[PDB]
Design a protein around this nucleic acid. Structure first.
Lengths: 137, 113, 177, 55, 49, 78
RNA sequence: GCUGACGACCAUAGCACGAUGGCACCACCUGAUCCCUUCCCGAACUCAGAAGUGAAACAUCGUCGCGCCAAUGGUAGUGUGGUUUCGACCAUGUGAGAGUAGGUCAUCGUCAGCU
RNA sequence: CCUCCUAAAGAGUAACGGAGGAGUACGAAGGUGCGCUCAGAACGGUCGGAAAUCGUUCAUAGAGUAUAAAGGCAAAAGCGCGCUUAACUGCGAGACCCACAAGUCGAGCAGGUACGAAAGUAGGUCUUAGUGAUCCGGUGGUUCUGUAUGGAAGGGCCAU
């Protein structure tokens, strides 16, 4: 359950998600990269589940890099409460995702096993994903 | 230190530039003393007098008497150049000793400030 | 000012010869001597300051100045702007005379002293020494002494480097390391 | 050196009997007994030990 | 910081109103202020307001 | 959960009042500001709230001058 | 040719490294009698002077080590009209930031002095 | 009432929208003249340490600015000293803001003043919060009025 240890402000605005992912579209740390073709919100629970499935598949044979962190807080309102009377608290944290953004990277493992693990992680995640080979340029 | 001396002269320099009057700036060294009159624009020298002048070059420079002389000659030069009302600029030097004698000579010899 | 007279005539030339300095002006000299007596007890009982000023004035030969604390610490319980320490600055002719008196009498009377550590220098050519007991100096009188207090002495030298600073002291004869 | 705000400061002669050495220097200390010195007469304070004799 | 009134020495009656703190200054305060009636600076004394 | 913070202050209407190249007479307020976002050069005076106003007739000019690269406002006689 | 004072401009003008400079000028530098200084100190400031040195500082020269400046092209955004799957797209006008090639050890003004 | 965002690069702009302060203080914490530069890091030094004071080297502000935040601050607006009361009187061309009532800035003129050798600065505090209309009553001045006339009462005008 990734979460910032402390934050300057408890609550944050909803914001708008637009544009392509110009930064973070290139794989650096690891040879094997998984990218998101669709924009959306990535929850900490989603990140944890994908990490756990990838770790189980690798069985300590490869190194995993997480390029997504849920710094942004999300406020949700409780049931049987009228609209207004103040903003709700941060039930959960999400990471804004843009098309082409790096989610996970793998190194030190065979391509086929990495592809299978990335397939499992994609199945868990809400984003369409295409595996991309790392390119120098 | 010349750095500190310029640091403590800038207040008066800026206030005189705001006033927009001709400025009688002094600059004294252990050997020589110089006085010159700068235009309100701050980039034109219209009158000058130092102990490098031939009249008092081969003499007791770096002295209160030399400062008094330089004041008298720059006062005459300013009178001949048409300047009558200036703002004194000790240029960070304490208004005292050679600077004070220079200022008093200039003030008594035609210039009023 | 026997040392002041001696330094220009003898010591300066031999320092230049010993260090093989290209130019005479490079040769170092002692710019200032500073004495510091910081005590925490002062400014609370308020009796310490008078005796400290008396002994410091008697030893130094100049009127000392009372510094004011610029910081407040909860652990030390010092509020802003209190007179916790006293210092004096000696230079030139009077400094050379003080240094002569110090070399003459102050260090020898010190009990259980063999020498000064060679690492005391900060590396920039400055020298610092600490005197355990103020009584060592002859100016103060043991009979009418309220309490014993230690002192700090600092010597400032133009040379930027410790080897030349130490050679400058050696020419003067400051007790061997 | 501001006037009148400083301690009494005067010539003093410091001698070591064991080393038989005379030193001349100005010190605030005052001595009841003085030794004659060819240059002039200034007060005497005895020294138990001297730097030169000190090992 | 109770209010105080300043009365001129001359007796013109022109007065100045200002606030002072009794704890930090219980004693009366004397100041020189311009007096329109006589057109000259004069001493002033604190008075009850 | 009640986080009671529904306060705000009234507007102050700061900003540039007369821009570059405009005719201006003595006394016109040029810039209302907090601190010296703009500084007063020749022909412009400075009030206690850091207001910049024209000391004489002319045309307002904006420039970046000096070592600190400060923004300056001047009134040129034109 | 160089030095000093006052300015324009405020890093392509800076920092860093190395070299040159003492006939003038500048700076250190000598002394604290006098003017004037220190909540102590001739450090600074101030005065009276040239025994000594360009050591430090200062000025000039050289470089690309840093800093700074910086294209062209492309991309992002964007006013107007239209379309839309609401992400965007088309026509037109505009056009960044970052990064890359590259550039830089400034350019001038008035007065005075030595040559 | 003040500061920031919402607020869409002039101003303005709402929510039981997201965050914090105010209902003071100072005769110096104002004015002027002069002078000074902080927080930290490392090294050395009696008690004395992680950190007291002293010395040295870097240090455009990583400090301080009476106070919440924004902006600003080197000619410092920050920090010290000497003398001082401009924390003045009568105003004030011209502007900002504004339904009104209000509110804000302001060169300059006249009188007196403080500082400075002087040109000069000073109509409170680096600015933006520290606030309350009218009626009524009280007080210090005032020749304006004064129910036949002279007074007085009361009323009016200025200050509070």
């Amino acid at each position: 359950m990734l979460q910032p240890k402390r934050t300057k402000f408890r609550k944050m605005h909803k914001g708008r998600n637009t544009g392509l992912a110009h930064r973070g579209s290139t794989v650096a740390f690891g040879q094997f990269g998984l990218k998101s073709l669709t924009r959306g919100r990535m929850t900490a629970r989603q990140i944890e589940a994908a990490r756990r499935t990838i770790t189980r598949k690798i069985k300590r044979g490869g190194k995993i890099w997480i390029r997504v962190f849920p710094d942004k807080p999300i406020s949700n309102k409780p049931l049987e409460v009228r609209m207004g009377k103040g903003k709700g608290p941060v039930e959960y944290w999400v990471c804004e995702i843009k098309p082409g953004k790096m989610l996970y990277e793998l190194e030190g493992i065979s391509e086929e096993l990495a592809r299978e693990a990335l397939t499992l992680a994609a199945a868990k995640l809400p984003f369409k994903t295409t595996i991309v080979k790392r390119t120098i340029m | 230190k010349k750095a500190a001396r310029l640091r403590r002269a800038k207040k008066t320099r800026a206030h005189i530039r705001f006033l927009g009057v001709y400025r009688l700036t002094v600059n004294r060294t252990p050997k020589h003393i110089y006085a010159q009159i700068i235009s309100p624009n701050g980039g034109e020298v219209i009158a000058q007098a130092s102990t490098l002048d031939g009249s008092l070059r081969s003499g007791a420079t770096g002295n209160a008497d030399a400062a008094t002389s330089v004041g008298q000659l720059i006062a005459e030069r300013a009178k001949a150049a048409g300047i009558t009302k200036v703002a004194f600029d000790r240029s960070g030097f304490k208004y005292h000793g050679r600077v004070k004698a220079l200022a008093e000579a200039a003030r008594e010899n035609g210039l009023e400030f | 000012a026997r040392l002041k007279a001696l330094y220009n005539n003898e010591l300066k030339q031999k320092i230049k010869e010993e260090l093989g300095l290209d130019n005479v002006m490079q040769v170092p000299k002692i710019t200032k001597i500073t004495l510091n007596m910081g005590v925490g007890g002062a400014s609370q009982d308020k009796k310490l300051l008078e005796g400290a000023v008396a002994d410091m004035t008697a030893i130094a030969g100049q009127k000392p100045v009372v510094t004011k604390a610029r910081k407040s610490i909860a652990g030390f319980k010092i509020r802003e702007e209190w007179p916790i320490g006293c210092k004096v600055t000696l230079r030139g002719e009077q400094m050379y005379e003080f240094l002569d008196r110090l070399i003459a009498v102050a260090i020898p009377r010190v009990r259980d002293f063999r020498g000064f550590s060679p690492k005391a220098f900060d590396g920039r050519g400055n020298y610092s020494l600490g005197i355990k007991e103020q009584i060592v100096f002859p100016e103060v009188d043991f009979d009418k002494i309220d309490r014993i207090r230690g002192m700090d002495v600092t010597i400032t030298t133009s040379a930027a480097t410790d080897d030349e600073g130490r050679a400058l002291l050696k020419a003067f004869g400051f007790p061997f390391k | 050196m501001r006037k009148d705000i400083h301690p009494d400061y005067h010539d003093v002669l410091f001698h070591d009997t064991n080393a038989d050495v005379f030193f001349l220097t100005r010190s605030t200390v005052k001595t009841k007994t003085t030794r004659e010195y060819e240059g002039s007469e200034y007060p005497y304070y005895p020294l138990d030990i001297s730097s030169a004799s000190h090992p | 910081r109770d209010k105080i009134k300043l009365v001129s020495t001359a007796g013109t009656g022109y007065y100045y109103t200002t606030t002072k703190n009794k704890r930090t200054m219980p004693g009366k305060m004397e100041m020189k202020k311009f007096d329109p009636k006589i057109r000259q600076h004069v001493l002033f004394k604190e008075a009850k307001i | 959960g009640s986080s009671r913070n529904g306060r705000d202050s009234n507007p102050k209407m700061l900003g540039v009042k007369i821009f570059g190249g405009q005719a201006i007479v003595a006394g016109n307020i040029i810039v209302r500001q907090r601190g010296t976002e703009f500084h007063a050069g020749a022909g412009v005076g400075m009030g206690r709230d850091h207001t910049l106003f024209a000391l004489n007739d002319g045309v307002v000019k904006f420039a970046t001058k000096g070592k600190f690269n400060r923004r300056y406002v001047m009134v040129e006689e034109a």
